[PDB]
Amino acid sequence: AIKIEGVEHEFATIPGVLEDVTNIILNLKQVRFKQIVPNADVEKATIVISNSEVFRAGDLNAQLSNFEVLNSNLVICHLDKSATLTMEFSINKGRGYVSAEENRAEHNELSTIAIDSIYTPIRNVKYAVENFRVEQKTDYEKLLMEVTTDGSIRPVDALREAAQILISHFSLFAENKIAI
Amino acid sequence: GRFRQNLLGKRVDYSARSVIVVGPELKMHECGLPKDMAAELYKPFIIRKLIERGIVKTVKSAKKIVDRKEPVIWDILEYVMKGHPVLLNRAPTLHRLGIQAFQPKLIEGKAIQLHPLSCTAFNADFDGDQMAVHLPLSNEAILEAQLLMLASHNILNPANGAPITVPSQDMVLGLYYITKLRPNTKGHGLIFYGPEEATIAYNEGKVDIHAPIKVYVEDYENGELVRRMVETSVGRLMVNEYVPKKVGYVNEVLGKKALRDIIGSVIKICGVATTAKFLDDIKNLGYYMAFKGGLSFNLADVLIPDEKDQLIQEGYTAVEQIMQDYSMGFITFNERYNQIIDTWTHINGRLSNVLIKQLSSDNDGFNSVFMMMDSGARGSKEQIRQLSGMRGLMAKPQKSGAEGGQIIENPILSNFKEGLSVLEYFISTHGARKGLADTALKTADAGYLTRRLVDVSHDVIITEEDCGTLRGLLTTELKQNEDVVASLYERILGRVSVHDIIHPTTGDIIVRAGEEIREQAAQIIEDSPIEAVEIRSVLTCESKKGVCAKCYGRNLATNRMVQRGEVVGVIAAQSIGEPGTQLTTGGLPRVTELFEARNPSN
Amino acid sequence: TPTTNNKRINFASIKNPLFYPDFLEVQLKSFHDFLQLDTPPERRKKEGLYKVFAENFPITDTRNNFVLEFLDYYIDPPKYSIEECLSRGLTYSVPLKAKLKLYCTDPDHEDFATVIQDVFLGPIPYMTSSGTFVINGAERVIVSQLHRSPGVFFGQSLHTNGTKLYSARIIPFKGSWIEFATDINNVMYAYIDRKKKLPVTTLLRAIGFEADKDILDIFNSIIFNTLQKDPCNSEKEALYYVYRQLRNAEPADDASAREVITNLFFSDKRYDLGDVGRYRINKKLNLNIDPDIKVLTNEDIIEIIKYLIELVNSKASVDDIDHLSNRRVRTVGEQLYNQFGIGLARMARTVRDRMNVRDNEVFTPIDLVNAKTISSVVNSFFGTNALSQFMDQTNPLAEITHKRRLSALGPGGLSRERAGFEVRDVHYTHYGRLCPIETPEGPNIGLISSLCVYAKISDLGFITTPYREVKNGKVDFSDNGLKYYTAEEEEEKTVAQGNAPLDENGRFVRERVKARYESDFPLVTPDEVDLMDVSPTQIASIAAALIPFLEHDDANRALMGSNMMRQAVPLLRPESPIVGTGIEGKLVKDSRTQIVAERGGEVVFVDASCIKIRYDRTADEEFVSFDDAIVTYYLPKYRKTNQSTTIDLHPICSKGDRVEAGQILTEGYSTQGGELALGRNVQVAYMPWKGYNYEDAIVLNERMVREDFFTSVHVDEYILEVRETKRGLEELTSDIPNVSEDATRDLDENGIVRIGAHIEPGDILIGKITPKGESDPTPEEKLLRAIFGDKAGDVKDASLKATPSLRGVVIDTKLFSKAAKKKSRTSTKEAVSKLDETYAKRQQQLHERLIEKLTELTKGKTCCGVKDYLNVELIKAGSKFTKKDLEALDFNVIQLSDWTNDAHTNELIKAVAVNYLKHSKEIEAELRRRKLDETIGDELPAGIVQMAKVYIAKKRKIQVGDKMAGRHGNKGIVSKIVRQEDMPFLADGTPVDICLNPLGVPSRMNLGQIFEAVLAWAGRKMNVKFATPIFDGASLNDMNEWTDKAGLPRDGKTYLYDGGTGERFDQPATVGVTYFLKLGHMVDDKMHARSIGPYSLITQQPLGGKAQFGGQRFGEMEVWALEAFGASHILQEILTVKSDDVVGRSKAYEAIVKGDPMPTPGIPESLNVLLHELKGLGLSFSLD
Known part of the structure; x- marks a missing residue:
């Protein structure tokens, strides 16, 4: 969710800011985050950029103690020498992907604009296999695997969690045998 | 002005309209239906079922809850949708197979999902048309729907005995994929028992999908019970697990021709529901196998023949001589035209055939273009020749005051592989838009034939179970002064006979009088040296105000005797009018001349 | 931002030694020939509006004592701006003024007075600087129209009763057409307009040829046979008859026939042949008399009848119609000329009428001319004519092809009832003049054929196009002198072709060269090629010369590909096609949709709403100074086009930039970085996936809905007029009866929806509540229910409610002008006088600085002598009329130096004259602003008081059912949105995004x-982008070399894997990158259904159309279908209760909801109507 001061809808424009509000929201979509503490449910932020600047990602003071930004060096927008901008954020946790209009749930209050949200923390995965052998005796196998993430969590934690869920599935489907 | 169009054409109040999309998961008697269309058409039934819930007392509250569609039950839509079929409706309905019923099914989004093998009945394409839907609301209507309307019963062509749902390019491609014959691969030359050992040995990669193996299988010799050692391949076994156990076993390369032959034999031997289940399952398996084979197209697939660079060159010198010959003028201009077009056609053919053979032999197991051509999925020798050989010849039409006719002296020798010079591409645009204009004008011409000849006729029905008229036609086969063009077989088939017939070989009654003549009997008769036979004609019916059941004969929509109470006339009208669109002295003039008792003026 | 600022790779095989002729030559060239804003001091030699006036005027009496004459017009600046016209709904037009000379001569005496009056004779719409007109708030175009060339033409018509009938045709510019045709009896007949036969001997003796024996003597059996069937045989009786068989039962006077024939063949003021008609007459007839009467002469008739008999006896050849040299062009200027001239001409007719009777001292030009007829005719031509059309204004390419559209319907060319196959076709001579490949099929195949790029219009209506000179082996210079050519001369010279490889020296490099010489098509020796096509990219139209890799494509595929490009929706963030041809860039430049840099300088200020540029100051120092000069260009930020596809722009230069002339400040509206950007690059794979790509459907990955490179915006407009009624006043108020407070929440207190809300269908948009007491039958009902509090009171609730199926976001709602500035201050004269005196004070002070500037900034010059000038100039400056002493400049001190330069003081002071003239213009416009502001205000429809409006915009994504396309014909529709996992993913973890059916x-x-796929894959690392000319593109070996150097399979193939099974698809699949477009048939507007709905008041049938849902036409054919099978109750309920029984429908509905599904069908009203409409008589209907 976003609440800009002096703009009421997704097609306005702010004096002295080189981009639309649409592009502000669109590129705010792309900023990947991280925790530092567990139990952080949802958070609201207040940015007051009030100086002759170029407004960038890490320029976001992760002013809430509960949370931080990984990618600091992204260009939100180019201000002029004189633009004054006030923004308010909401960051929340989730899975998979959700579109905008479902996020209309949270009380627009004539100002709030809901935005899309891509939650997935993974970017690329690999596995490959190839035989290895001793003379005359076979059945040696190489599995080589690669995990490429956003940095919000090391590969080991995610890999462990995936296996935990998969074993949790097969557990019931092997032991318990309720019958018709 | 008043009493013709809008006196009958109308508004409707339980209809809907939207766009259609191909269905690769549903059965033959189901359709995919966006959630809101279904949430709206069925609204009154839903309203009653909320009423019978007891939770609501007022239809106003029910409307309030069905409009805003809040987190309450769609279970009622799921239920009601399950026994309350829906009529799918095309806009330009030509013959009845443009209107059907279906069992509807929820899907995601805002598009109508429809099964791939039914559209050919609609004779439509998937450009994005906006099919209409209707809801019956009365149980007599719904019974007529799910008893006569429903698609699974409507598999034949009322025009004539052809089947309507011949499968398409991709299924025939997959089936052609499974049933080839490669000499030496995984697990050549071993022994099985049929099902168990074959499925085991394939399922453990000890034999690939395809290798010539010898196996012990059961097939009926007319019609019994021989179990021998056939040489075949897993694959053909997998499909022949599904060909019903009343015809025997299938051993050929399974093209399109053969697929139609088989679907015909199975329908004629065992009936409609059976042939339906067969066609559905063959769809599914061949379609999955075509996918898992991973078939695609590449440049390296298409080998231009080396000799083309030779051959295209070579004719030049021949052309050169026939140039210099006409240079010394002994030869007339038009015959120069004729000779050069002949030579270029010769080289075109000798390139095309060598092209196609080289295309065949590179793997014999696969060449995307080669199998797409030969399996009859889609393509032709001509298209593929363009994709790898000269464009051929093209006409000099001159587009006005000329027949066209005489064609360019120089063929378009470059093929689409290499690219075209500017002038050739200009000539191609010339000819192609010529063809498009020709098609547009032909469609315009056919429109009037269609409308008038559909407006030929309208009338009433047949009305008796027999017509007593033991004075029928002497039916025989017609041969037009060089050969025979129309067979007695279909001319005799399905038409009640008069006198019990026996073979010239002694003591074999072939028919009992007043019996439905059958395909087997028809074949026996054709083999016999009998010449003609006496059968009834809808004409000679004694029964006034109609025609007798036995007068007419086979139903042609099912494969049964026509029964009491069904209108034949409008069927005959539609079936005789619709082919007018292809009808290109012929045409409308002669047809209306003969119907309307006009003088030939000659 | 470190923007890429990248430069593409050209790849050709030959130089490009010839540029792009600009696009907008035709429209803006013509209109700037016709009229311009201001200063025609000494202009328009010879053609122009001045030619109109010197061809029509002066108008005098029947030698009676009174005359009118013309004194030059001035052309006035527009009263309102383009944008303000668009917003308001008016027409961008300029007022016109002319100094009419009334010249009253004393009755039966010498002259009485010789006076001039300034006449404002009406507004005429003006051309925005792109060739488009905003009429009533819409933007329209005058399309061109191919023409018939006037002159003489020769055709032996055939199959007309089998016999050959040669007809010669004389074709004028205005008037009737003349024919000379042979009868079946080999008898020769002359007549008019191809009409009924009339003997040529009869017309000959109608001209004044003597007795028939002498006619034979001067013309000698075709003429003899004509005499044999000639019903007249001597002069007097000859014309007596020739008038008799023109009308029946009416007299056949000789003298009337003489006058008729004389005016038919020899009247200058009754026969109107254009100079092009005379030219064609002269050339086809090989005549040597160009300057003469524009009308037929006797020698012309003699020569045409001689050539007529010469081709009657089969000694010549017929003519061709589709030949382009027989069609002219008549650009917008010519046809506006024609209508204007007709209007003024019969205006002169009626002024002749008025002044034929002429008193004195009672007529001054104020009452002489009711010229408003000129207003009528011109406004009608621009508002209703055949050729003026709305604009396909959804895509830059759509316009820039829309403005060289070349229609062929209506007067000027052939007619829709005269075309055979040729006007449906592409002739042998459309080469370069008229597009071969874009003549879109349908009802208009040949009719609306479009113009090539290099095509240029000569001065006669001949389409011309460049060639490069060629002689004796060289390209004569390749080249220094281009030779534009017209169609007519082309027909005898061998024209070689460009993709016949050259050195970079002007030499052909083979023995055989391809050429077209006659309508044949040979392969010629380069020892006699005489002239060469400039660029082999010539023979494609503008949208046709944008296809990558053409020479490997089908014609028809390219046709529909172009027709799909023409409607490509403007995306939300386009992307340069990493493959293309070197024509983008220029094409955005010709479009004036981007804020171009006017003059070099640095940029003071940039935002997305205004670009504030300090231009170069140097212009004011060949001056001394006059004022500050900084421009502020404002931006197109979201606005609705015709087709609802919004337009937007974004600046592309930074706060310290210095910008040169010809620079593009802004990207957007399908433009990126100065390049034409329609679609996106994407990863695609060619493999039939689960058969969801059965036919030419398509398969999508979830990234593509997540990357949002397939998204757009739409917006539409809602209007509502409130009106003075005959019985009440209409209102825009919030007090809407019977509606709920929530439906008013989005409404402001001013009865309209505020900006900043979302709309659910059915809610109020514009609150219109109107106490229209037109119910003169008991308005006490008005009062009775208007005092209840809800005030329905026959006070009609006309509050427009949100259409079903519409959801969106509210933009800005205007209120326009509401009939009165006088609305406060408890006074009328007080407020108006306060406003006038404020007007006066800032007038006087601004003009005071204006006087100071003109005075002290003019005195600087090297004029020598005593001062003598400051005080006199000041006292003149106190009461500047600005004309008395403007040129004099006190006429002494500047005159002391007899020799002087250009008089920079004169330059400065006429600049001040201009600046105060424009200042007075806007200040008097401000005056009329306020004055009419206390009135109905802006130009508003007479019978209504106000019109309100709202804008609604919708942000639209992709979903199943939408249509997609590409640049090679691949139309398709989305079938399934696949999750990213189980897309077939290559050996490096990247799942493909689009899967297509091979x-x-x-x-x-x-x-x-x-081919496009392989290259765009070999580039997307990314290496440098590509660009190749159409028919000189990238060869295959070089393709292979790049694919190698990018680290790829040299063959375009690869292996692939399945998510779900890991299997390696045993045959290698193809993968690549391709360019992809989204077309405008979005499925969100193909949804409708209905169960129950509102009922009509003329029949118990509920209409439909998604304006109100309704149903579909249950036509005749499905009546026949339910006939064919045994429809038991289906058909009966369709024709009885499903429709057209509101009583039966209500009963059946209430029964279905009430638990009785058994109907009781009765008798439709159609039969009730049948008994009622038959009318019975003495009535005998039945009860049995």
Whole structure:
């Protein structure tokens, strides 16, 4: 969710800011985050950029103690020498992907604009296999695997969690045998 | 002005309209239906079922809850949708197979999902048309729907005995994929028992999908019970697990021709529901196998023949001589035209055939273009020749005051592989838009034939179970002064006979009088040296105000005797009018001349 | 931002030694020939509006004592701006003024007075600087119209009763057409307009040829046979008859026939042949008399009848129609000329009428001319004529092809009832003049053929196009002198072709060269090629010369590909096609949709709403100074086009930039970085996936809905007029009866929806509540229910409610002008006088600085002598009329230096004259602003008081059912949105995004798409982008070299894997990158259904159309279908209760909801109507 001061809808424009509000929201979509503490449910932020600047990602003071930004060096927008901008954020946790209009749930209050949200923390995965052998005796196998993430969590934690869920599935489907 | 169009054409109040999309998961008697269309058409039934819930007392509250569609039950839509079929409706309905019923099914989004093998009945394409839907609301209507309307019963062509749902390019491609014959691969030359050992040995990669193996299988010799050692391949076994156990076993390369032959034999031997289940399952398996084979197209697939660079060159010198010959003028201009077009056609053919053979032999197991051509999925020798050989010849039409006719002296020798010079591409645009204009004008011409000849006729029905008229036609086969063009077989088939017939070989009654003549009997008769036979004609019916059941004969929509109470006339009208669109002295003039008792003026 | 600021790779095989002729030559060239804003001091030699006036005026009496004459017009600046016209709904037009000379001569005496009056004779719409007119708030175009060339033409018509009938045709510019045709009896007949036969001997003796024996003597059996069937045989009786068989039962006077024939063949003021008509007459007839009467002469008739008999006896050849040299062009200027001249001409007719009777001292030009007829005719031509059309204004390419559209319907060319196959066709001579490949099929195949790029219009209506001179082996210079040529001369010279490889020295490099000489098509020796096409990219139209990799494609595929480009929706963030041809860039430049830099300088200020540029100051120092000069260009930020596809722009220069002339400040509206950007690059794979790509459908990955490179915006407009009624006043108020407070929440207190809300269908948009007491039958009902509090009171609730199926976001709602500035201050004269005196004070002070500037900034010059000038100039400056002493400049001190330069003081002071003239213009416009502001205000429809409006915009994504396309014909529709996992993913973890069916490919010969795919994959690392000319593109070996150097399979193939099974698809699949477009048939507007709905008041049938849902036409054919099978209750309930029984429908509905599904069908009203409409008589209907 976003609440800009002096703009009421997704097609306005702010004096002295080189981009639309649409592009502000669109590129705010792309900023990947991280925790530092567990139990952080949802958070609201207040940015007051009030100086002759170029407004960038890490320029976001992760002013809430509960949370931080990984990618600091992204260009939100180019201000002029004189633009004054006030923004308010909401960051929340989730899975998979959700579109905008479902996020209309949270009380627009004539100002709030809901935005899309891509939650997935993974970017690329690999596995490959190839035989290895001793003379005359076979059945040696190489599995080589690669995990490429956003940095919000090391590969080991995610890999462990995936296996935990998969074993949790097969557990019931092997032991318990309720019958018709 | 008043009493013709809008006196009958109308508004409707339980209809809907939207766009259609191909269905690769549903059965033959189901359709995919966006959630809101279904949430709206069925609204009154839903309203009653909320009423019978007891939770609501007022239809106003029910409307309030069905409009805003809040987190309450769609279970009622799921239920009601399950026994309350829906009529799918095309806009330009030509013959009845443009209107059907279906069992509807929820899907995601805002598009109508429809099964791939039914559209050919609609004779439509998937450009994005906006099919209409209707809801019956009365149980007599719904019974007529799910008893006569429903698609699974409507598999034949009322025009004539052809089947309507011949499968398409991709299924025939997959089936052609499974049933080839490669000499030496995984697990050549071993022994099985049929099902168990074959499925085991394939399922453990000890034999690939395809290798010539010898196996012990059961097939009926007319019609019994021989179990021998056939040489075949897993694959053909997998499909022949599904060909019903009343015809025997299938051993050929399974093209399109053969697929139609088989679907015909199975329908004629065992009936409609059976042939339906067969066609559905063959769809599914061949379609999955075509996918898992991973078939695609590449440049390296298409080998231009080396000799083309030779051959295209070579004719030049021949052309050169026939140039210099006409240079010394002994030869007339038009015959120069004729000779050069002949030579270029010769080289075109000798390139095309060598092209196609080289295309065949590179793997014999696969060449995307080669199998797409030969399996009859889609393509032709001509298209593929363009994709790898000269464009051929093209006409000099001159587009006005000329027949066209005489064609360019120089063929378009470059093929689409290499690219075209500017002038050739200009000539191609010339000819192609010529063809498009020709098609547009032909469609315009056919429109009037269609409308008038559909407006030929309208009338009433047949009305008796027999017509007593033991004075029928002497039916025989017609041969037009060089050969025979129309067979007695279909001319005799399905038409009640008069006198019990026996073979010239002694003591074999072939028919009992007043019996439905059958395909087997028809074949026996054709083999016999009998010449003609006496059968009834809808004409000679004694029964006034109609025609007798036995007068007419086979139903042609099912494969049964026509029964009491069904209108034949409008069927005959539609079936005789619709082919007018292809009808290109012929045409409308002669047809209306003969119907309307006009003088030939000659 | 470190923007890429990248430069593409050209790849050709030959130099490009000839540029792009600009696009907008035709429209803006013509209109700037016709009229311009201001200063025609000494202009328009010879053609122009001045030619109109010197051809029509002066108008005098029947030698009676009174005359009118013309004194030059001035052309006035527009009263309102383009944008303000668009917003308001007016027309961008300029007022016109002319100094009419009344010249009253004393009755039966010498002259009485010789006076001039300034006449404002009406507004005429003006051309925005792109060739488009905003009429009533819409933007329209005058399309061109191919023409018939006047002159003489020769055709032996055939099959007319089998016999050959040669007809010669004389074709004027205005008037009737003349024919000379042979009868079946080999008898020769002359007549008019191809009409009924009339003997040529009869017309000959109608001209004044003597007795028939002498006619034979001067003309000698075709003429003899004509005499044999001639019903007249001597002069007097000859014309007596020739008038008799023109009308029946009316007299056949000789003298009337003499006058008729004389005016038919020899009247200058009754026969109107254009100079082009005279030219064609002269050339086809090989005549040597160009300057003469524009009308037929006797020698012309003699020569035409001689050539007529010469081609009657089969000694010549017929003419051709589709030949382009027989069609002219008549650009917008010519046809506006024609209508204007007609209007003024019969205006002169009626002024002749008025002044034929002429008193004195009672007529001054104020009452002489009711010229408003000129207003009528011109406004009608621009508002209703055949050729003026709305604009397909959804896509830059759509316009820039829309403005060289070349229609052929209506007067000027052939007619829709005269075309055979040729006007449906592409002739042998459309080469370069008229597009071969874009003549879109349908009802208009040949009719609306479009113009090539290099095509240029000569001065006669001949389409011309460049060639490069060629002689004796060289390209004569390749080149220094281009030779534009017209169609007519082309027909005898061998024209070589460009893709016949050259050195970079002007030499052909083979023995055989391809050429077209006659309508034949040979392969010539380069020892006699005489002239060469400039660029082999010539023979494609503008949208046709944008296809990558053409020479490997089908014609028809390219046709529909172009027709799909023409409607490509403007995306939300386009992307340069990393493959293209070197024509983008220029094409955005010709479009004036981007804020171009006017003059060099640095940029003070940039935002997305205004670009504030300090231009170069140097212009004011060949001056001394006059004022500050900084421009502020404002931006197109979201606005609705015709087709609802919004337009937007974004600046592309930074706060310290210095910008040169010809620079593009802004990107957007399908433009990026100065390049034409329609679609996106994407990863695609060619493999039939689960058969969801059965036919030419398509398969999508979830990234593509997540990357949002397939998204757009739409917006539409809602209007509502409130009106003075005959019985009440209409209102825009919030007090809407019977509606709920929530439906008013989005409404402001001013009865309209505020900006900043979302709309659910059915809610109020514009609150219109109107106490229209037109119910003169008991308005006490008005009062009775208007005092209840809800005030329905026959006070009609006309509050427009949100259409069903519409959801969106509210933009800005205007209120326009509401009939009165006088609305406060408890006074009328007080407020108006306060406003006038404020006007006066800032007038006087601004003009005071204006006087100071003109005075102290003019005195600087090297004029020598005593001062003598400051005080006199000041006292003149106190009461500047600005004309008395403007040129004099006190006429002494500047005159002391007899020799002087250009008089920079004169330059400065006429600049001040201009600046105060414009200042007075806007200040008097401000005056009329306020004055009419206390009135109805802006130009508003007479019978209504106000019109309100709202804007609604919708942000639209992709979903199943939407249509997609590409640049090679691949139309398709989305079938399934696949999750990213189980897309077939290559050996490096990247799942493909689009999967396409290989089946559709090898039957429609368009393997250009896979070539594009391989290159765009070999580039997306990314290495440098590409650019190749159409028919000189990238060869295959070089393709292979790049694919190698990018680290790829040299063959375009690869292996692939399945998510779900890991299997390696045993045959290698093809993968690549391709360019992809979204078309405008979005499925969100193909949804409708209905169960129950509102009922009509003329029949118990509920209409439909998604304006109100309704149903579909249950037509005749499905009546026949339910006939064919045994429809028991289906058909009966369709024709009885499903429709057209509101009583039965209500009963059946209430029964279905009430638990009785058994109907009781009765008798439709159609039969009730039948008994009622038959009318019975003395009535005998039945009860049995």
